[PDB]
Design a protein around this ligand. Structure first.
Ligand SMILES: COc1cc(-c2cncc(-c3ccc(C4CCN(C)CC4)cc3)c2C)cc(OC)c1OC
Ligand SMILES: COc1cc(-c2cncc(-c3ccc(C4CCN(C)CC4)cc3)c2C)cc(OC)c1OC
Ligand SMILES: COc1cc(-c2cncc(-c3ccc(C4CCN(C)CC4)cc3)c2C)cc(OC)c1OC
Length: 283
């Protein structure tokens, strides 16, 4: 039979230290092609190893299509092919777009759904998985208003995380590295920062906050590990909840939820399943 393996790379939609992501075309259908730098080969190997262990299939997990390794003259080329989400990342989306109560809840419940699916062990099934780099750039927006979680290059089954999103126990090196639940609790911290980023863009009583990344007001751009440790661990700062949220029942409930993702004590934080249940009772 014919194995049509050609992908037409049409436009670059992301470029970083990781490498590049392209919109591509296979048999008339859009795909996303992540081309890895030499620098970040181990991210391709880890995501490939995970998908070779468990073929994750969930509406709120970026859809896997293929892992490709091609021999070149002097190098190895590593591609990850996935579903293509033309609306781009949540980070991208929140820059110009504002949300209402329905769209805000749909976004955050879809993220919680994807995260709970990663975290849960299913017997007969899937191993439990922690993401370890959850942030708004690693979440894609779908046309139906739900999101999907991307980038399992740091995932662990039962490179470091983006420093801005690191939990206190990562920054102070107290994380119980032999305990899988520790890595879940690091994801929940990061989830709470994403929830704050999204909630800011939800309009209430004619008011919205501008898009800002977590800790924009207390660390530099490209904060150092030390910058983050002093804010999060030493001073125990947390993102600001604006007064205007306390006039809106949805943002009042979301403020309480994000507080319960940011406890210094990792074992006090809510689980992804408890976050879903709380979100299904809002509105
Ligand atoms: C190797 O590499 C690439 C392959 C492909 C590709 C292209 N046409 C058809 C296929 C195909 C799928 C599955 C079967 C099955 C049929 C049932 N039978 C019992 C077992 C075998 C056969 C054929 C594939 C896998 C695309 C690629 O790009 C997206 C590839 O490169 C990453
Ligand atoms: C990787 O991704 C894509 C793959 C394909 C694709 C191409 N040829 C053949 C197949 C296939 C056929 C038949 C089986 C069999 C397996 C065992 N049993 C006998 C029942 C079913 C499996 C696989 C597929 C899935 C199409 C795609 O899109 C239209 C893909 O997505 C980009
Ligand atoms: C986070 O990580 C990965 C993401 C993706 C991915 C999947 N769908 C769509 C995208 C995308 C498309 C388009 C835009 C822009 C361009 C046009 N307009 C001006 C605004 C929107 C941005 C983003 C991406 C980047 C694939 C990945 O792997 C193949 C990723 O890595 C795991």
């Amino acid at each position: 039979r014919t194995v049509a393996r050609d992908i037409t790379l049409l436009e670059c939609v992301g470029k970083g230290r990781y490498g590049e992501v392209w919109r591509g075309s296979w048999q008339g259908e859009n795909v996303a092609v992540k081309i890895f730098s030499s620098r970040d080969e181990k991210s391709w190997f880890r995501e490939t190893e995970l998908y070779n262990t468990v073929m994750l299939r969930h509406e709120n997990i970026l859809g896997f299509i293929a892992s490709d390794m091609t021999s070149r003259h002097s190098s190895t080329q590593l591609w990850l092919i996935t579903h293509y989400h033309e609306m781009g990342s949540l980070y991208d989306y929140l820059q110009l777009t504002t949300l209402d109560t329905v769209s805000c809840l749909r976004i955050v419940l879809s993220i919680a759904s994807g995260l709970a699916h990663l975290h849960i062990e299913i017997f007969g099934g899937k191993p439990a998985i922690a993401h370890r780099d959850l942030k708004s750039k690693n979440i894609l927006v779908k046309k139906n208003g739900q999101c999907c979680i991307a980038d399992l290059g740091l995932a662990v089954m039962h490179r470091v995380g983006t420093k801005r999103y690191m939990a206190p126990e990562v920054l102070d090196e107290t994380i119980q590295v032999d305990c899988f639940d520790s890595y879940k609790r690091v994801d929940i911290w990061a989830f709470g920062l994403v929830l704050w980023e999204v909630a800011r863009r939800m309009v209430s009583n004619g008011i919205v906050e501008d898009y800002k990344p977590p800790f924009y007001d207390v660390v530099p751009n490209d904060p150092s590990f030390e910058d983050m440790r002093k804010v999060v661990c030493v001073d125990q700062q947390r993102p600001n909840i604006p007064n205007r949220w306390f006039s809106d029942p949805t943002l009042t409930s979301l403020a309480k939820l994000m507080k319960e993702c940011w406890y210094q004590n990792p074992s006090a934080r809510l689980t992804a399943l408890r976050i879903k249940k709380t979100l299904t009772k809002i509105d």
